[PDB]
Amino acid sequence: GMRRTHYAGSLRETHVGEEVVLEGWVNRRRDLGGLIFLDLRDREGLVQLVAHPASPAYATAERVRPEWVVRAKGLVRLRPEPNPRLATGRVEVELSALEVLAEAKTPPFPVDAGWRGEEEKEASEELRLKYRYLDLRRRRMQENLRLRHRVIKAIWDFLDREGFVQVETPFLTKSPEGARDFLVPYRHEPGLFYALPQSPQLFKQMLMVAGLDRYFQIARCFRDEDLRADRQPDFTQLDLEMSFVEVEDVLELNERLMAHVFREALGVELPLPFPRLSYEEAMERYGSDKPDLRFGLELKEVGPLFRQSGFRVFQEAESVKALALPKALSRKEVAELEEVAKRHKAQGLAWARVEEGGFSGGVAKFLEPVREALLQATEARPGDTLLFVAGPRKVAATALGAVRLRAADLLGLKREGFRFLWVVDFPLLEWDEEEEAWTYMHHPFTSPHPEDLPLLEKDPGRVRALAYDLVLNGVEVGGGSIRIHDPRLQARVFRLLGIGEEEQREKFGFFLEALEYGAPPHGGIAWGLDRLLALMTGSPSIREVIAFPKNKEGKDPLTGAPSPVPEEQLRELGLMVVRP
Amino acid sequence: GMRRTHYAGSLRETHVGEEVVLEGWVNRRRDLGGLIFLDLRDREGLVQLVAHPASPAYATAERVRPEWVVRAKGLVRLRPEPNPRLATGRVEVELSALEVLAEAKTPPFPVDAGWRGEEEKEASEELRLKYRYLDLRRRRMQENLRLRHRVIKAIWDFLDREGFVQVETPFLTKSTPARDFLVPYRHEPGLFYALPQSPQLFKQMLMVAGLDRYFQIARCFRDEDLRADRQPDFTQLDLEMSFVEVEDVLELNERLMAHVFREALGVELPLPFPRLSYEEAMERYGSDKPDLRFGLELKEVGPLFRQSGFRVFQEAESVKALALPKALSRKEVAELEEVAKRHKAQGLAWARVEEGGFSGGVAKFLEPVREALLQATEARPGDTLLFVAGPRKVAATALGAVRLRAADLLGLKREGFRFLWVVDFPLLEWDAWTYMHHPFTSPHPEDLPLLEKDPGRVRALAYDLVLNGVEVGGGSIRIHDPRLQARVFRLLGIGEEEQREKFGFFLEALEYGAPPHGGIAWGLDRLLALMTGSPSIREVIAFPKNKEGKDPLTGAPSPVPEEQLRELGLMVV
């Protein structure tokens, strides 16, 4: 069997008197009074080795330096003075033998602090990525990756128990998730390309057409996007699909799945069911289709109060949203929120102060005429600051919702735990204020609400969709919808999305024919697995929960990718670089 | 909650008297004696629905057609006579309601027979692939895909219990000089990612990172000849371990495989697996992937003919002998001889075995050494002796292929699953010298001094897992000493510029303390095809490419608009 008898970091007082064999890295060396103290590291933690001058292991111990790999044998004994910061802190290993398995030169950054329970100084991420195999020696990085393992294993356990069949779908396929495709040239016939999948969407629907009933996959998705916050050229999804389901069925199974993951992987109980809010209700109360429920400060609509007002900018406005903050902001803080507000298309930010009887500051003059009804609607108290955005309903909500989020940081609010919610009843379409056009909120295979089918021709903008987003602490972690299983309706919805018979046959012909052979009702969802794991670990970037990620430009400094290729290899594909 | 109360195919006698709601596809319709019989299908199997003339669903049941999607409601009843070919064979559902959820065109091929337990006529695979979503309705295809699920889940359960960490590795990586599938980098035309040939370097770096043991259901991409039932991308079970010897890797993979077969197939694999050195396998079977489902081992008999007048035997480097337990026809022998010649042999000698002597071909030259030849081959009266004389590797390889062909001719029973390890492969082979698998494969430590003196005799710490004459897995212990790795490169004539070009980043990683480590990769698609008795891995892949590497279902690979390609800064030559 293995020479190793225990993991180094797993030794305890119960092992005293036992002879052990250990293998690991030298976390640090310290010589004192002729003794050589070596902190031996493996994935379970640190344990102290002691090399005594009279021991055969001493000569070898004198050569050892940090990050050397060694095999150690000796007796477990109590330390005269225990180190309470270590799980092995009460014991040490009196060495009888020591062998060097590998030498190592000094690393470009330290990996030893985390294993001692000490704080780790910040290191250049570009350098960490260049030496990612060393960065992954740190305790925090291994904790993240082992959490990722526990999460995926819990997903397998739960969904296998629920009858879901894991199916692996192709990576070399044809060119719809609303992004740019990554292409793979077909060598035997230039001009032909595969496309890496933006998602397994159409394959998992065809698996429902095939009668598998319910499917899941830890699928890798590839999307070539530009301006994206914390973008990676590829990412991981928990993808799943179900047949003969309504919206409620997909939601019910997912929250039960999420509760199982958090319980088994984090030991956290998630109260069930998750809170549910419609798209309209979420925008009105929070000005965001991904509300952050870790605090209050809800938005109140104050439009019907200004229909008799001399303030033309309020009285004419479609919407005036107000927010009461429990603090008297400085003009700098107000100006900070005003800049945030203006960045979201608002006409401006109004401000004031709530005082014992009247109002003071900002637009306080215009606040004085109204009060009995207004104070009841906002519950504002002396010492508060009132902020207002007036405008179109969607603008007014979205601008003051971003102000709401920014103000939570300025005020230093304690935002704790994990607050999930479902956002449901999305409109089938979203108005592009920029391009003055209709665009879909979820992919074009989403089912419109069946009660609204006649509105497809009459009034497109009123059509609801059977779509849903899963939100965690103000972040979209998942999204899905009930699909269209009737071929007539799917073409209808394509013609409505500016797609004629030509683009349909070329881009989706195979799938539309599949719907003609008896497709069942079905729907599903996809999680952003990297995103969810980043939130579960309090990481600021998904790069902290991916083993070998790219940097912000989509480059790999460790391997040198992307890189050029020989002219010969490029001619073989029948392609050349366009000369500028 | 859900509308359906049960899976259609899950109903048994225990459900009699219950009112059920079922949803599925119309497998078949029969009108008999005024009753309308509908076979309702879902993934769990068929159940018989019965519409009676008095039932509100009578008219509906009459107009439905095969593959229509329907929701049925009714009372579970015993059949008057059970149909034991259905798991639901004892019961039926008296229809009170029938609702059409989707009509369906006539499929281009049938998908109903297998669900009744009937043989299915072979259909054009191109047609099956073009309508794969219909092909996957067949029972056989759903059983394959669900076995694949149970196998992967069993791998997760076992390796998680043994302390392995699943780690996902990049799909967009560095192109290096097999041919790489490339991915253009939009922001700088002329730069490309590559899809990974394997996770090798990444999993070795995870050992350098101290994770100790890793695994991954990894996808590999290799743009090479697709003949021999190859796909552009395929699935490996890939794992790596630290502080291990060859023994440790084999032992864990044996127990893992036994667990997979037990949980996924209900089959018990005796442990430990047999082991043969590469040399023993070639000597006894003429192949580095022996098929242990039958005997017929090869025997070296060259040293019996050193004083024999028969030139071709006497002067041959090696004479391999094979005893078939049947007297062959003059035709069969010529088929085996043609097989031998097809494998570089000079020919195939033969002779029939009698009670007191020989008779057939070289029988005359065998009588002088009769006693020794029978103790060596254990041949008996009625057998047929076959011989190939020539170079050791040629004679073994040729008669080993004859051995396999003879198994078919004799109609031998080849049943079950026979695993074995092939170990102690040579580290190098002639061309100057070259490696036999990967330049990171560790030499056998007790052969290290031979690395420069006699390279051809250096054993490697490599191993192949073979199932019924098919390689299903392979791996090795890796080099963790950069000084030894440089020593191997010097022996191979691989200069520094070439090392940095191919392995620079990983060679530098060895300088930071790499532990002893090793691993293996299974050909998961190949294994599943063998576990299901399928002739091609296409049968165990949901949406595979055809034999030519193209996807008839979607039409990929297909052209793109010139503006989609212009945006990447590339143009067709």
Ligand SMILES: Nc1cc(CO)cc2ncn([C@@H]3O[C@H](COS(=O)(=O)NC(=O)[C@@H](N)CC(=O)O)[C@@H](O)[C@H]3O)c12
């Ligand atoms: N996390 C993450 C990172 C990056 C790096 O640049 C890009 C991402 N692009 C997406 N995600 C995450 O995947 C989730 C689902 O993807 S989806 O496009 O919304 N919907 C679909 O794909 C539908 N086919 C699902 C269905 O309808 O069943 C999002 O909620 C994000 O958490 C990304």
Ligand SMILES: Nc1cc(CO)cc2ncn([C@@H]3O[C@H](COS(=O)(=O)NC(=O)[C@@H](N)CC(=O)O)[C@@H](O)[C@H]3O)c12
């Ligand atoms: N099944 C299968 C199908 C196809 C369709 O085109 C192509 C294949 N190419 C390979 N395989 C299967 O993968 C196994 C391991 O792959 S390897 O190249 O030998 N070694 C390695 O890749 C090392 N990284 C492993 C290590 O040393 O740890 C083989 O034993 C085959 O069963 C293929």
